[PDB]
């Protein structure tokens, strides 16, 4: 009973960090594809003034 | 003649003035160009403070 309680916050902590890294990656995915988006944009506007 | 000197002159003048339209005409476009690509990272240097 010592040992359970102890494994449980082991088993919550991984949970949470897990959770941390997740919603860190999201939000890295996210950002990437709004900068590739504002980039691409700007490709086509340099193309239309040669 | 010497009419024919001045006639080449006024060749090089009018090549001179249409040649530096043309370069105002490229830099304006270069203005724009650049004025947009700070305007472009600045908006998107904004909205990564948004999302932490």
Known sequence: SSALDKLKEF?????????????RIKQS???????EWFSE???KVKEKLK
Do not use: W
């Not at 949970?15 to 890294?21: G, H, I, N, P, S």
């Not at 995915?29 to 900068?35: F, G, I, P, V």
């Open 11 to 23: 088993g919550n902590t991984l949970e949470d960090k897990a959770r941390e890294l997740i919603s």
């Open 29 to 35: 995915e996210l950002s990437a594809k709004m900068r």
């Open 41 to 43: 944009t700007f490709q």
